[PDB]
Symmetry: C2
Subunit: 426 residues, 2 copies
């Protein structure tokens, strides 16, 4: 008595979760997932890949994944496949429907309906009104209970968008969530989790990293985790992070080299390691031309691969630029500086860029004039930053040393301008 | 197990609402003071009374809630009534009234069979899978992925995997705090709810916080609903933020009429009088002292009702202290200072305090010795802040004086120079 769609809308699977919310870009999202899947966290994999291929218009190839998934489901979670396939089947249902295939869609809505009548609880249904009655309860509890409350109102609106009550709920919840951001007492469930799964070494590295964030336990946690599963890339990846943060670049570079052997095209890996080489450069400078030249070479090769993979996910041009700068490569430096200006930029960052480039003009190039354009355009940007305040100090310096020579006319404007900002603040 | 199956019913007993609360009193208060401001209400309450052994007391609200639901939703009584029944059943189980328990479960099973969807099922393994997926998309799906594993634990608590999920979701939400759009949902909800003035005030507070229409919204809601406390209370916050506290105070006074003794109201109005007490001081060209004191008198009385009601929700001793201090009624200032020290406090707060007190001890009280102790202790604390400096600084002045007239102070210079030693090496970095 109803559109085959309306019925498909009620199935639980990837199509009915809402995974593209706020994803401006399907290529971005495709790369973001393909790069993350190279870390072997299972069959949920094949479903996520299917969902994408469908979105890429490759429906044919999507079935290819759904199929490999229900093979994994049958072999490993084998004794009980009926409930484990619920989403895989509903993904089939949706893929076929987009292929205009009414016949198999119907098959799978059947394999679903069956397993659903067989394991249905006589205790709990599904409801917008249930999710809502709960969201109000949590809201009236308040505190960390309001984040769970937002989801509640979200879940009630997916089914029935535009409702007045559920929308009240969402709005109040959200306002509270923006005003008083929730506390993540993660350190606990990480502990509970490690208790439950000692074998899983990834969990240990997260305890180890969050401890160091809230500062002996950590170092041992990572060493156990590195000891048991050196190969597992989630472990190497996040271990390396651990050491970069403890100012141990060699340990991190070593780790990430190892992970790269497993998946040598991973962009997150090239980015990470490039950054670690960059961390060694500064450290070395703090504590030699061939080494800087060779090291700077490394960071550059790696960051280039990330920038080439996906310019939006790997915003790495500033760094490549300041890096080509150290190596006295001034042409490359330019190329990458001019590339950062074309892209989107938080006023905050656009400032840091004007400063960075300004200094590059001021010290590397002979052009103080160019430097001035940026400190100025950088300071006109209304963001309270140490960077604005650093570019001020510099423009006062240059305007003064100018009136030193000729009491010149242009400076008398910059000088006043600046003095107009100091008087206000206070 | 009877309980194993009572986990399968959606009711406050399975919402795990006490997660992160280590005091039941603080909880019952937060809730009770917000209930001075509904079927949802009676159930929440029923849950409270139960939580305090008063189970016949809980059954009461439940009967009332049910009665109320039949009026609001007579046609939907059986579907609205789900949550209530699941409470009934749990309450009875905790009273050992097994036979009445079977009755409310028997009602729930019938309703569920009647209304079950043939396409979807609620399952902890279907929440877990979704959680893993959202986890793998990352980003904003992270908070949504936490709930998924949580939802899986309430249904199936103690599982290795579901907790693994929850661990990781939670690590990442800490690392990368989700973005929070609230401006859209509010306009969308105001349009959909033209009679709920509260939303309008909320939107106004979010606008002004992004700086007009701010005042437009508030004034409409005020004239549409001059008796709704949610509205009066949030409008007052608006006007304080606006800096025009005087209107704030007037609103709060109005809300107080409806609820004489609300600790939240009192704390809020109290803080307002205090904001005026500052403002008055800045002009300083005549008001006078006889006026400060009329105002200090007002704030102190309202903050005191909150302190009395709660010493944990209303952490208002540091404020009371420096309020009697300005007053010159030092004896009282002692009390609130003594109480503040003997309480859990942040290292940074315990500096401010060492400071606020150090100053007190120097200027009004004339004990130079005592201040010295605190500036010392507040600088010994391993924290970095503006107050530590203002504090190292007062020990600079007072050290120099001892040099000019003991030699003890020479060591106050040593530690001083010794401290600022390491510090400059950081600024250069």
């Amino acid at each position: 008595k109803n559109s085959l769609e309306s019925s498909l809308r009620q199935l639980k699977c990837h199509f009915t979760w809402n995974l593209m919310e706020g994803e401006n870009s399907l290529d971005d999202f495709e790369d973001k997932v393909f790069y993350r899947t190279e870390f072997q966290n299972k069959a949920t994999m094949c479903n996520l890949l299917a969902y994408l291929k469908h979105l890429k218009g490759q429906n044919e190839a999507a079935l290819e994944c759904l199929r490999k998934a229900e093979e994994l489901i049958q072999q490993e979670h084998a004794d009980q496949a009926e409930i484990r396939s619920l989403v895989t089947w509903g993904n089939y249902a949706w893929v076929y429907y987009h292929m205009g295939r009414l016949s198999d869609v119907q098959i799978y809505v059947d394999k679903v309906k069956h397993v659903c009548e067989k394991f249905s609880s006589p205790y709990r249904i599904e409801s917008p009104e249930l999710d809502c009655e709960e969201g109000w309860t949590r809201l009236k509890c308040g505190g960390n209970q309001n984040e769970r409350a937002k989801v509640c109102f979200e879940k009630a609106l997916e089914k029935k968008p535009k409702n007045p009550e559920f929308t009240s709920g969402l709005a109040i919840a959200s306002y509270r969530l923006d005003n008083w951001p929730p506390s993540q007492n993660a350190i606990d469930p990480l502990r509970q989790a490690i208790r439950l799964n000692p074998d899983n070494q990834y969990l240990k590295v997260l305890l180890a990293l969050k401890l160091h964030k809230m500062r002996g336990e950590g170092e041992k946690l990572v060493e156990e985790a590195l000891e048991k599963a050196p190969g597992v890339t989630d472990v190497l990846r996040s271990a390396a992070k651990f050491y970069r943060r403890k100012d141990e670049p060699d340990k991190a570079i070593e780790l990430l080299k190892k992970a790269l052997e497993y998946i040598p095209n991973n962009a997150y890996l090239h980015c990470q390691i490039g950054c670690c080489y960059r961390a060694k450069v500064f450290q070395v400078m703090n504590l030699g031309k061939r080494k800087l030249l060779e090291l700077i070479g490394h960071a550059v090769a790696h960051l280039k691969k990330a920038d080439e993979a996906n310019d939006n996910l790997f915003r790495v041009c500033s760094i490549l630029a300041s890096l080509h700068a150290l190596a006295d490569q001034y042409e490359e430096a330019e190329y990458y500086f001019q590339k950062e200006f074309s892209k989107e930029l938080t006023p905050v960052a656009k400032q840091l860029l004007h400063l960075r480039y300004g200094n590059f003009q001021l010290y590397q190039m002979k052009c103080e004039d160019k430097a001035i354009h940026h400190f100025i355009e950088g300071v006109k940007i209304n963001q309270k930053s140490r960077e604005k305040e650093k570019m001020k100090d510099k423009l006062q310096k240059i305007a003064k040393m100018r009136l030193s020579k000729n009491g010149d006319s242009e400076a008398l404007h910059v000088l006043a301008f600046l003095q107009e900002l100091n008087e206000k603040m206070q």
